[PDB]
Amino acid sequence: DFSAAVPFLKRPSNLDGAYIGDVGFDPLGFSDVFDLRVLREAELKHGRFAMLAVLGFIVQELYTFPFFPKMAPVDAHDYFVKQGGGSQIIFWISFVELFGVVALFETLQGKREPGDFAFDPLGLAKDEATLERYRLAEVKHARLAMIAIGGFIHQYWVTKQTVLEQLGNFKSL
Amino acid sequence: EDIVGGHIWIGFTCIAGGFWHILTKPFAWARRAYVWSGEAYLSYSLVAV
Amino acid sequence: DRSYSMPFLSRPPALDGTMAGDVGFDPLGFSNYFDLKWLREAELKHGRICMLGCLGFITQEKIQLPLPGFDNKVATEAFFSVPAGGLWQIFFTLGAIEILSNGGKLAPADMFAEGRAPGDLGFDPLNLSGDDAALRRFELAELKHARLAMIGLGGMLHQMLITKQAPLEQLANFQPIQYY
Amino acid sequence: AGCTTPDWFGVSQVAEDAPGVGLLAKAAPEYNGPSFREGLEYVFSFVWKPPILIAWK
Amino acid sequence: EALGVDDGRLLVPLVLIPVFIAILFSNFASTQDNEDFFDTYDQRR
Amino acid sequence: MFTLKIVVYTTVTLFVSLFTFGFLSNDASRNPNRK
Amino acid sequence: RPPGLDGTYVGDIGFDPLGFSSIIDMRWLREAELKHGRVCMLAATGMIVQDVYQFPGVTKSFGDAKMTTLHDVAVKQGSMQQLLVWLGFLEIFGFVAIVQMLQGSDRQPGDFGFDPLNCAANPDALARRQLVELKNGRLAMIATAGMLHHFFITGKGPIQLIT
Amino acid sequence: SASLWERFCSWITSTDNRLYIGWFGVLMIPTLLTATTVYIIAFIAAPPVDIDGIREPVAGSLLYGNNIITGAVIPSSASIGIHFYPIWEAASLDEWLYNGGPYQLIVDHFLLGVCGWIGREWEFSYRLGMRPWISVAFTAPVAAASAVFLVYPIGQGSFSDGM
Numbered sequence: 001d002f003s004a005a006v007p008f009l010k011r012p013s014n015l016d017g018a019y020i021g022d023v024g025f026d027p028l029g030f031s032d033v034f035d036l037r038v039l040r041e042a043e044l045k046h047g048r049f050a051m052l053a054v055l056g057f058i059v060q061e062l063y064t065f066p067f068f069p070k071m072a073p074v075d076a077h078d079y080f081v082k083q084g085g086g087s088q089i090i091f092w093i094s095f096v097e098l099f100g101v102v103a104l105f106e107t108l109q110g111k112r113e114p115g116d117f118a119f120d121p122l123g124l125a126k127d128e129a130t131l132e133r134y135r136l137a138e139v140k141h142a143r144l145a146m147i148a149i150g151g152f153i154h155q156y157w158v159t160k161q162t163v164l165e166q167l168g169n170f171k172s173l
Numbered sequence: 174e175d176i177v178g179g180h181i182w183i184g185f186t187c188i189a190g191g192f193w194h195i196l197t198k199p200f201a202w203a204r205r206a207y208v209w210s211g212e213a214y215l216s217y218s219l220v221a222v
Numbered sequence: 223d224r225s226y227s228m229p230f231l232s233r234p235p236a237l238d239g240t241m242a243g244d245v246g247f248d249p250l251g252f253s254n255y256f257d258l259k260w261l262r263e264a265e266l267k268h269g270r271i272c273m274l275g276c277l278g279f280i281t282q283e284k285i286q287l288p289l290p291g292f293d294n295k296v297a298t299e300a301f302f303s304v305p306a307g308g309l310w311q312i313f314f315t316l317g318a319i320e321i322l323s324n325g326g327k328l329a330p331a332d333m334f335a336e337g338r339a340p341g342d343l344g345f346d347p348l349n350l351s352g353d354d355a356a357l358r359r360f361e362l363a364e365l366k367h368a369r370l371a372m373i374g375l376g377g378m379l380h381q382m383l384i385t386k387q388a389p390l391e392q393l394a395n396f397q398p399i400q401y402y
Numbered sequence: 403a404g405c406t407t408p409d410w411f412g413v414s415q416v417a418e419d420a421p422g423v424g425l426l427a428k429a430a431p432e433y434n435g436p437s438f439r440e441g442l443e444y445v446f447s448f449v450w451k452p453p454i455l456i457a458w459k
Numbered sequence: 460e461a462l463g464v465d466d467g468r469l470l471v472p473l474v475l476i477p478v479f480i481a482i483l484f485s486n487f488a489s490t491q492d493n494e495d496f497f498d499t500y501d502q503r504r
Numbered sequence: 505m506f507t508l509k510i511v512v513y514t515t516v517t518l519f520v521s522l523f524t525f526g527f528l529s530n531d532a533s534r535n536p537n538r539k
Numbered sequence: 540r541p542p543g544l545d546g547t548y549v550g551d552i553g554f555d556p557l558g559f560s561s562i563i564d565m566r567w568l569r570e571a572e573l574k575h576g577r578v579c580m581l582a583a584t585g586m587i588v589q590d591v592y593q594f595p596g597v598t599k600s601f602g603d604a605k606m607t608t609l610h611d612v613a614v615k616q617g618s619m620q621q622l623l624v625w626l627g628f629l630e631i632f633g634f635v636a637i638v639q640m641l642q643g644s645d646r647q648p649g650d651f652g653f654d655p656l657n658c659a660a661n662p663d664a665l666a667r668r669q670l671v672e673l674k675n676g677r678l679a680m681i682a683t684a685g686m687l688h689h690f691f692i693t694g695k696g697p698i699q700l701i702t
Numbered sequence: 703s704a705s706l707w708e709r710f711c712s713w714i715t716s717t718d719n720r721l722y723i724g725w726f727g728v729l730m731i732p733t734l735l736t737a738t739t740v741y742i743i744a745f746i747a748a749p750p751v752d753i754d755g756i757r758e759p760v761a762g763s764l765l766y767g768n769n770i771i772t773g774a775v776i777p778s779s780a781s782i783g784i785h786f787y788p789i790w791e792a793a794s795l796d797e798w799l800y801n802g803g804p805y806q807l808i809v810d811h812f813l814l815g816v817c818g819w820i821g822r823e824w825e826f827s828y829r830l831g832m833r834p835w836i837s838v839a840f841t842a843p844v845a846a847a848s849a850v851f852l853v854y855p856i857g858q859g860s861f862s863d864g865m
């Protein structure tokens with residue numbers, strides 16, 4: 001019983017400390033049923049989408065462009081579904097995911113770390129220690145934003161108020 | 174007028190084609206497609222007439 | 223090892239540094255399953271046609287022939303304004319040019335049977351291929367212009383279809399798409 | 403006289419080691435590989451059998 | 460009029476299809492030996 | 505009626521072209537006595 | 540020091556954050572730099588002068604006019620067409636000179652042989668004047684850009700801001 | 703074998719098929735099948751045809767009160783004459799059926815099919831290495847069919863005079 005995060009559940013068989021953020025948290029059987037590389041790739045993609053979504057949820061409420069009407073983010077999804085901008089965003093996300101398919105195929109073969117697209121224009125994470133610290137921060141922020149975006153969306157669906165609009169004048173249910 | 178013009182075109186086209194066939198040899202697509210014998214030429218003339 | 227175009231995807235097996243315009247960009251294994259000479263010939267043909275098409279898109283807006291029916295600013299509408307007999311004459315002339323250039327070898331099995339290099343149709347009135355480094359840089363420039371012209375012709379043609387306006391004409395009085 | 407002059411040759415301002423410059427001009431790889439029909443079948447397998455779902459195994 | 464062609468679009472099948480097949484025929488024609496044979500018919504195929 | 509006409513023209517042109525280029529493909533050589 | 544940037548060229552202080560000299564021939568870069576600098580010297584001088592003299596008959600032709608508006612009126616008049624065609628005629632032989640320089644010749648970037656006053660007789664004077672020309676040309680580029688964008692924001696010439 | 707077109711030619715002129723196709727069959731099979739299905743559909747359910755062109759239609763279909771003996775595909779309307787009358791040359795499908803257009807369709811496709819049958823008999827005789835004059839024998843019923851279906855309407859000036 002040495003899972004190191006849940007003391008009574010033991011370390012999972014393939015959850016060695018090779019991966020960043022590996023605290024042994026896998027109570028249900030998922031790493032023993034699916035490839036860990038694919039799981040890490042899916043985790044990073046979900047978390048990056050969630051981080052961008054949380055930042056967008058803040059910014060769109062705080063400021064919307066001179067163009068487009070003043071809308072809440074969910075109403076924004078509906079309006080851009082009916083307008084055509086959502087189709088453009090879906091088209092370009094699908095275009096990037098077309099090569100993401102090949103990247104995941106490589107990850108299945110090897111020669112590519114899960115979630116590694118070699119995207120680093122500003123030249124950050126110089127030296128390995130800084131890279132490991134940034135990896136840990138990235139994974140933690142990814143999971144936190146994965147929880148937070150669902151929190152934002154379900155709270156808007158329940159209270160009919162946006163997040164910072166809800167922070168003041170809470171109006172408890 | 175149409176008859177005379179068409180016969181002008183036919184005469185000049187026949188002269189040009191005659192000079193062509195005098196100065197040329199059948200092409201590869203024509204050589205492999207036709208039978209080259211007297212009876213074959215006779216049959217071609219027969220269907221034409 | 224790596225592609226250097228997409229540094230997360232590794233270099234394609236058939237994309238060595240020998241061919242011009244090779245930055246390792248082949249995410250889908252087209253070079254693995256198709257002949258590179260045929261692919262390069264098709265790329266160069268598409269791009270040269272697109273370079274001529276972009277030049278025509280600009281020129282026909284700028285200058286028109288005084289023949290009747292040849293006075294359409296919009297190139298897409300100019301295709302249908304021009305008599306169809308002339309367009310078919312153009313098509314037959316281009317087909318004759320293609321057949322003469324390839325010498326009857328119009329298939330990937332026989333087009334490069336004699337070699338002839340991909341995209342080398344023997345058109346070089348000025349001997350600008352004498353220097354090898356100059357020839358390689360000219361090949362890279364030709365490929366870059368070909369790809370840029372393909373993208374630009376696609377954009378100009380679709381924007382002409384939407385706005386019914388010639389490209390330089392459409393640049394002024396922009397009138398976003400929802401206006402039409 | 404057909405531009406057969408030692409000084410007659412093209413010039414480009416780009417460096418010869420710029421990315422995208424081929425090692426040899428007019429490359430003609432042999433391509434001892436799959437036939438055209440196999441390539442067309444591969445392009446069709448792009449749309450009826452993509453590697454999307456084999457990752458979740 | 461002409462070949463029953465009262466609409467210009469009718470010219471598209473009448474040209475593209477004969478050309479395309481011809482292109483296929485070209486792959487045949489380039490394969491065959493196109494030298495003279497001096498015979499009633501060419502047995503080389 | 506135009507779509508039916510274009511379909512018929514396409515079909516007839518295809519079959520006539522197949523016939524014409526098939527009899528151009530050295531049809532005389534397709535005999536059992538050919539060596 | 541940046542790669543591909545040797546000290547054989549005047550005005551070199553090893554200033555190249557972006558490797559333009561590593562992907563483009565330095566002869567072409569120096570020729571382009573000198574041409575841009577000379578064009579900018581002439582342009583800045585003209586933009587300053589056009590706020591003062593305006594020539595005898597230009598006033599009733601173009602009205603008042605200024606900078607971009609002056610370009611817009613002059614392209615409609617015909618002066619811009621004449622200047623464009625004649626400078627293009629000159630730039631044809633400029634292109635020939637650039638091609639011959641890249642092919643290998645005694646020519647150097649910016650050496651058009653235009654020394655009517657024989658000011659290049661002293662070699663050290665010419666060596667100093669090359670750096671003088673480079674720095675005044677770079678200053679002229681910066682100044683012409685400044686005048687253009689100041690006219691964009693306010694619609695005033697270089698002297699209307701001073702006076 | 704050598705090329706795709708060569709493989710297609712080998713399959714077309716193959717003697718291993720249950721029914722020989724050949725190049726003449728390439729034209730014969732579509733025309734004969736089209737004429738056959740159109741004839742069956744017309745014999746079963748065609749509307750009555752104004753053969754005499756004086757607005758009194760004549761029924762020849764099974765669904766309109768005919769048996770096998772009395773059923774027929776009525777010749778084209780006398781107003782049509784020997785004008786080419788395809789489906790696309792009629793204002794409506796009802797108008798095409800009313801003027802005896804299916805008769806022209808069946809007759810033309812059947813004549814093309816029997817010409818293809820003559821050629822295909824010759825073609826398979828050549829493929830088998832036998833003598834080719836069975837098609838010469840078959841020309842006689844083809845001649846009779848063309849005389850009663852095409853030549854007589856041409857001489858009389860109307861497809862309504864055809865059998």
Ligand code: CLA
Pocket residue numbers: 186187189190191193194197198199200203204
């Ligand atoms: C009695 C006259 C006669 C004869 C027997 C020939 C015989 C020949 N010629 Mg020559 N020729 C002639 C007149 C003649 N020619 C004339 C007058 C011209 C000038 C135009 C030519 C120009 C000419 C050229 C340029 C070529 C030949 C070639 C050939 C050979 C193959 C032809 C072939 O396959 O036809 C092919 C037939 C067709 C593809 C059909 C075309 C029909 C056109 C489109 C008109 C259609 C009219 C109508 C709608 C359909 C017919 C209706 C009918 C009832 C009248 C063959 C040895 C070829 C060869 O190998 O020689 C080097 C070749 O390249 N001929």
Ligand code: CLA
Pocket residue numbers: 260261263264265267268271312313314316317318320321324327328329478482
């Ligand atoms: C008599 C006319 C004629 C003839 C015989 C030829 C003969 C030839 N041409 Mg063509 N050509 C002609 C006229 C002609 N040309 C004209 C007038 C033009 C316009 C200026 C072209 C433009 C052209 C191009 C652009 C290309 C050729 C090519 C070829 C060669 C291969 C032919 C082949 O296999 O294609 C048979 C026909 C096909 C295979 C069908 C075309 C394929 C479709 C259009 C691709 C569609 C892709 C799709 C839209 C993208 C997917 C989108 C995604 C969202 C799913 C051959 C020598 C090709 C070549 O040399 O390859 C190396 C080539 O790339 N030609």
Ligand code: KC2
Pocket residue numbers: 304305307308309311312315
């Ligand atoms: C570069 C491709 C090309 C070539 C190689 C080429 C060669 C020849 C030759 C052989 C040497 C002759 C004899 C010839 C004759 C005519 N051509 Mg020409 N021609 C070419 C291109 C075009 C276009 C684009 C048009 C055109 C026209 C005409 C008309 C006018 C008919 C009329 O008077 O109405 C006539 C008589 C126009 C057209 O047919 O309009 C209905 C028109 O748009 N052509 N053409």
Ligand code: KC2
Pocket residue numbers: 594595596597599600601616618
């Ligand atoms: C070489 C020095 C010089 C230059 C570089 C130059 C450039 C331009 C441009 C260039 C953009 C325009 C557009 C322009 C226009 C006119 N010039 Mg001018 N011009 C120059 C010199 C002279 C002289 C010596 C005279 C003169 C005149 C006129 C008149 C007359 C009718 C009018 O006033 O309505 C008009 C329209 C005459 C005059 O009557 O001046 C009041 C006259 O004597 N210019 N001028």
Ligand SMILES: CC1=C(C#C/C(C)=C/C=C/C(C)=C/C=C/C=C(C)/C=C/C=C(\C)C#CC2=C(C)C[C@@H](O)CC2(C)C)C(C)(C)C[C@H](O)C1
Pocket residue numbers: 272273274276277345346347348349350367368370371373374375377378381389390393
């Ligand atoms: C080979 C050969 C030789 C030769 C030669 C030749 C004939 C050379 C000719 C070369 C040509 C004509 C190249 C043309 C390229 C055109 C391009 C790249 C257009 C791009 C358009 C774009 C990017 C766009 C756009 C647009 C979009 C999309 C929408 C708009 O809202 C905006 C905008 C307008 C910007 C010669 C004889 C010299 C010598 C030799 O011995 C052999």
Ligand SMILES: CC1=C(C#C/C(C)=C/C=C/C(C)=C/C=C/C=C(C)/C=C/C=C(C)/C=C/C2=C(C)CCCC2(C)C)C(C)(C)C[C@H](O)C1
Pocket residue numbers: 074077078146147149150151153
């Ligand atoms: C459908 C719809 C759309 C949509 C949409 C979208 C994006 C829907 C997505 C909703 C999401 C992402 C919900 C997330 C739920 C996550 C939960 C409950 C986990 C919490 C964490 C826990 C419990 C942690 C527990 C833990 C803690 C620390 C301690 C114990 C251990 C541990 C287990 C780790 C639109 C908006 C586009 C509009 C359209 O018209 C329709």
Ligand SMILES: CC1=CCCC(C)(C)[C@H]1/C=C/C(C)=C/C=C/C(C)=C/C=C/C=C(C)/C=C/C=C(C)/C=C/C1=C(C)CCCC1(C)C
Pocket residue numbers: 175176177178179180182183206207523524525527528
């Ligand atoms: C290639 C090929 C295919 C496969 C089979 C094959 C055997 C291997 C071969 C077959 C080849 C075949 C079957 C080739 C046969 C092809 C044929 C039959 C060609 C007919 C040509 C007739 C023309 C152009 C008429 C011109 C009349 C004019 C100008 C009249 C003018 C008139 C005048 C004088 C008087 C006034 C009226 C007007 C109208 C004005």
Ligand SMILES: CC1=CCCC(C)(C)[C@H]1/C=C/C(C)=C/C=C/C(C)=C/C=C/C=C(C)/C=C/C=C(C)/C=C/C1=C(C)CCCC1(C)C
Pocket residue numbers: 297298299301372373375376377379
């Ligand atoms: C209708 C009509 C008009 C006239 C009559 C007609 C002739 C019969 C007919 C014409 C029909 C014709 C000729 C129609 C021709 C239509 C054409 C040419 C369509 C081409 C579109 C090009 C595209 C979408 C390329 C996009 C490039 C991208 C996304 C680049 C991506 C990039 C890559 C991968 C690299 C990384 C960076 C980024 C930027 C991300």
Ligand SMILES: [Mn+2]
Pocket residue numbers: 858863
């Ligand atoms: Mn009668």
